[PDB]
Amino acid sequence: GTFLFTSESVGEGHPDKICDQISDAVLDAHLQQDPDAKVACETVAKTGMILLAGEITSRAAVDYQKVVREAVKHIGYDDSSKGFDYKTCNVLVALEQQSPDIAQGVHLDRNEEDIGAGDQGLMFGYATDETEECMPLTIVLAHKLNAKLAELRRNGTLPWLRPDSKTQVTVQYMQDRGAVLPIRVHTIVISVQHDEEVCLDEMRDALKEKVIKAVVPAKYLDEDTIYHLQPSGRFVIGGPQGDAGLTGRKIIVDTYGGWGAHGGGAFSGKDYTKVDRSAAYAARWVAKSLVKGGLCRRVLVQVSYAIGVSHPLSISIFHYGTSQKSERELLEIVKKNFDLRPGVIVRDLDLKKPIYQRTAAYGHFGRDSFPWEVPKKLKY
Amino acid sequence: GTFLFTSESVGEGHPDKICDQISDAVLDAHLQQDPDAKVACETVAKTGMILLAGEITSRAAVDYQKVVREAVKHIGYDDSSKGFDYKTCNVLVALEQQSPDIAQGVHLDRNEEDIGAGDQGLMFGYATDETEECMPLTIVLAHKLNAKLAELRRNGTLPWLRPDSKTQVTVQYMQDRGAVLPIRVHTIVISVQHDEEVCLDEMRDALKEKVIKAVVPAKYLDEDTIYHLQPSGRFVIGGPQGDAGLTGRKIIVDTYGGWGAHGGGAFSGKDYTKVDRSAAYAARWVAKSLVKGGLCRRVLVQVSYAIGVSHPLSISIFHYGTSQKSERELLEIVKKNFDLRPGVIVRDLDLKKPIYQRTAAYGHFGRDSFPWEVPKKLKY
Ligand SMILES: CN(C)c1nc(=O)n(-c2cccc(NC(=O)COc3cccc(-n4c(=O)nc(N(C)C)c5ccc(Cl)cc54)c3)c2)c2cc(Cl)ccc12
Ligand SMILES: C[S@@+](CC[C@H](N)C(=O)[O-])C[C@H]1O[C@@H](n2cnc3c(N)ncnc32)[C@H](O)[C@@H]1O
Ligand SMILES: C[S@@+](CC[C@H](N)C(=O)[O-])C[C@H]1O[C@@H](n2cnc3c(N)ncnc32)[C@H](O)[C@@H]1O
């Protein structure tokens, strides 16, 4: 009854993640001045270039050059030796107003609570009791390995590190009546951009001793564990110079690491009226409320919308066999306890607050007691 | 024990799908001349602009202006009145060689069968017996609604239609020992860009009578079915002018419409050495082979890779309770029947053939008897 499951994560300097962080720096800059900004900011990154493309209608006055360059500086791309420099890169802007046809169909002359969804689409929330934060262990560990690399880069412990990294964790699980229990780490991958001088053996030793052993409990590592550390052999070229990045190309890293399900929408660069983000956050909040409320050990929630319509078109629950209550009964508890209109989710989850850049690396879920991570006390 | 499930699809002129089709037009143009081209072509679209960004190492001589404009012409964006015109748009190119550090770690001086995965990552395959093609009914119907809009646009039936469209289908299902059986269509959304002259009532009537009734069997539609037809009320501005598009932002439309699982990787613009595409195609082939072989009614397959390593790091099977065989026994049948190294998948699935633009609208799976849709006869 044991099985393997694999999740990945990427670091703050992975080029896709650069784009998510910049898109959310732009969103936060707008929301600091105009809580009702309509923002749909995509970012593209390639050698020497950040391009902003999309639609923003806002009363804010935002200095895009400053906002983009400060985000890149924070990530750590500050010199041509590293492949990218916030001081000297090109910042190109192709931003227009929100389509008036979308505005009139979504929010023009609507009561806030009765604002339409900003698009159609489907969204999922997931929670699992295998960790306190109700996240899969594979993705938590993958994120923490990237965070550890950034910590050792920033504290000068491993000064050959650059910001672009990827990690991947395969866990052997057992099943218990549809719940899952981690047993051991079967395989770890780490790839991280590095300077021209450090040798492979020095990097592999440091990644095992100072990264993996610092993050992963010894009880999960044994003589069988497989390590793929700098498996390409050389990763000097990195960041956007090694690989073009785009906003919304890490949607599985952003959510559950492959567990549960995904409706396809990207989070970063979008205000609350874009249900791709707000309804996925609300669905996480529902799922985590069901698990912390003791109604199931793990659960998947689907919701869906039509553009211009406030109430969800569908709400669905899958409990993997981990509840005494039927999925019908759980769906009735959800409908009695939650209002998933976007103009209500914004109030419950405080989604005009400019905290979005903080969500755009290391996953949107399972961290920092954001509002969607604080369970609602359920009445039934 | 009934439940709702929702999937969406988008049309050929949805701005994200424009980008996927251009990325794959570029890939095909390279493969026509150099079957071993290394291609990683991202496309971005906004008003008046197609930008290509990424990495290509190829012996081909490709006219990017011609390839991009021909793809946009095929989609139907041929006049400023429609919001985009292949004849007059800007085509910008930011394409460099493949990173030499990736090349040396993946494929340089490797036997083809023993080429390394072109990246780490995780990928899933899915199949379900609810349709002959082993796809979920929700996503099949959503795709066919977009195809019907394009057909009636191209045959001049509904000359007010433009290429940008979205559809969404919610089906009520029953469960039968982990298999799922569609009962009825609960809700349909259609949004499609249109000309300045046609009125809402004319469009809603046509969408119901000439689109929905042409596609969806009457046995699924009843007095309760909910229709959201042009729910925004106005969609004259569309294509990249209404919404920026990027390659790899429709990964759930490309796969199973939310069913099964997704590892996060985009398909379009990538040659076979990028396991995001080749291993997802191979995992579909495995899943469909298990269902057509009578071993399960539905099944999810996970695989994962490390950059530079040929064999998968993990392979996993979830049969939703729909097999007499254990998931362990199914995994042993998979391992005895399939070799999921990328340099073997390329031979089994013929992945140097320039047919990729054909995959880049209406889903990659369940259509046209591509190699990954032809089940393998299993020995066990
Ligand atoms: C009620 N009914 C029948 C419904 N059926 C449905 O399929 N979905 C539904 C629809 C769309 C998508 C998904 N996505 C997933 O739940 C499947 O997802 C994953 C992902 C990642 C891992 C696993 N998974 C895993 O979790 N456990 C495993 N164990 C414990 C063996 C496992 C083993 C191997 C593998 Cl490859 C995967 C495994 C499974 C489910 C429903 C959704 C709703 Cl909201 C309501 C009702 C249903
Ligand atoms: C392998 S690249 C994707 C394929 C690439 N576009 C190509 O042209 O082959 C994806 C990610 O892997 C990482 N990467 C880049 N160069 C790498 C290298 N030399 N070794 C390992 N990983 C690398 C970076 O995080 C990058 O964003
Ligand atoms: C609603 S837009 C995403 C949000 C948009 N970026 C914004 O600025 O609000 C997503 C997709 O919906 C469709 N769309 C565009 N304008 C629309 C309209 N007026 N009514 C309905 N759907 C529309 C197009 O397919 C577009 O690519």
XYZ file of C-alpha atoms and ligand atoms in Angstrom, chain A residues 3-5 124 126 174-175 178-180 258-261 298 300-302 316-318 320 327, chain B residues 3-5 124 126 175 178-180 258-261 298 300-302 316-318 320 327, ligand 1:
92
model
C 3.473 4.846 -3.122
C 5.799 7.643 -4.231
C 4.775 11.238 -4.855
C -9.709 24.413 -6.466
C -7.044 21.581 -1.006
C 1.440 5.043 3.184
C -2.345 5.357 2.891
C -7.855 7.755 2.129
C -5.502 9.893 4.333
C -1.826 9.852 3.501
C 0.658 18.507 -7.729
C -1.672 17.309 -4.995
C -5.329 18.172 -5.256
C -6.250 19.898 -8.530
C -8.044 15.737 3.425
C -10.629 19.011 -2.474
C -13.053 21.895 -3.179
C -14.031 23.066 -6.672
C -18.127 20.592 -5.275
C -16.400 18.563 -2.539
C -14.189 15.442 -2.736
C -11.013 11.050 -0.574
C -19.672 14.906 0.272
C -21.988 15.937 -7.843
C -21.195 18.805 -10.196
C -17.942 19.281 -12.072
C 0.610 13.506 -15.020
C -5.147 10.692 -17.021
C -20.335 7.844 -9.118
C -14.941 5.217 -8.309
C -15.932 5.579 -12.034
C -17.978 8.578 -12.989
C -9.367 20.081 -14.199
C -9.784 16.329 -13.857
C -6.766 14.261 -12.887
C -3.728 16.398 -11.956
C -10.107 5.681 -14.757
C -3.950 8.938 -12.889
C -0.221 8.420 -13.634
C 2.568 10.558 -12.170
C 3.022 6.386 -9.496
C -0.511 5.133 -10.212
C -3.888 6.124 -8.691
C -9.650 5.768 -7.955
C -1.938 0.227 -7.748
C -16.773 12.514 -5.949
N -16.005 12.189 -7.176
C -16.023 10.781 -7.546
C -15.085 12.999 -7.725
N -14.116 12.429 -8.444
C -13.071 13.131 -8.887
O -12.163 12.624 -9.597
N -12.884 14.441 -8.502
C -11.762 15.102 -8.974
C -11.946 15.938 -10.056
C -10.892 16.697 -10.595
C -9.638 16.519 -10.092
C -9.450 15.684 -9.040
N -8.146 15.669 -8.650
C -7.790 14.793 -7.746
O -8.389 14.738 -6.698
C -6.765 13.695 -8.108
O -5.581 14.246 -7.653
C -4.404 13.765 -7.117
C -3.315 14.564 -7.295
C -2.088 14.209 -6.776
C -2.005 13.010 -6.067
C -3.096 12.204 -5.946
N -2.961 11.028 -5.270
C -3.475 10.996 -4.006
O -4.049 12.011 -3.598
N -3.438 9.888 -3.308
C -2.755 8.840 -3.742
N -2.840 7.750 -2.972
C -3.308 7.997 -1.628
C -2.755 6.384 -3.513
C -2.055 8.805 -5.022
C -1.249 7.770 -5.524
C -0.658 7.913 -6.793
C -0.895 9.075 -7.506
Cl -0.226 9.222 -9.145
C -1.661 10.109 -7.014
C -2.215 10.000 -5.786
C -4.309 12.526 -6.455
C -10.521 14.916 -8.461
C -13.839 15.132 -7.774
C -13.646 16.446 -7.454
C -14.643 17.092 -6.757
Cl -14.348 18.757 -6.250
C -15.816 16.470 -6.344
C -16.032 15.105 -6.622
C -15.027 14.425 -7.342
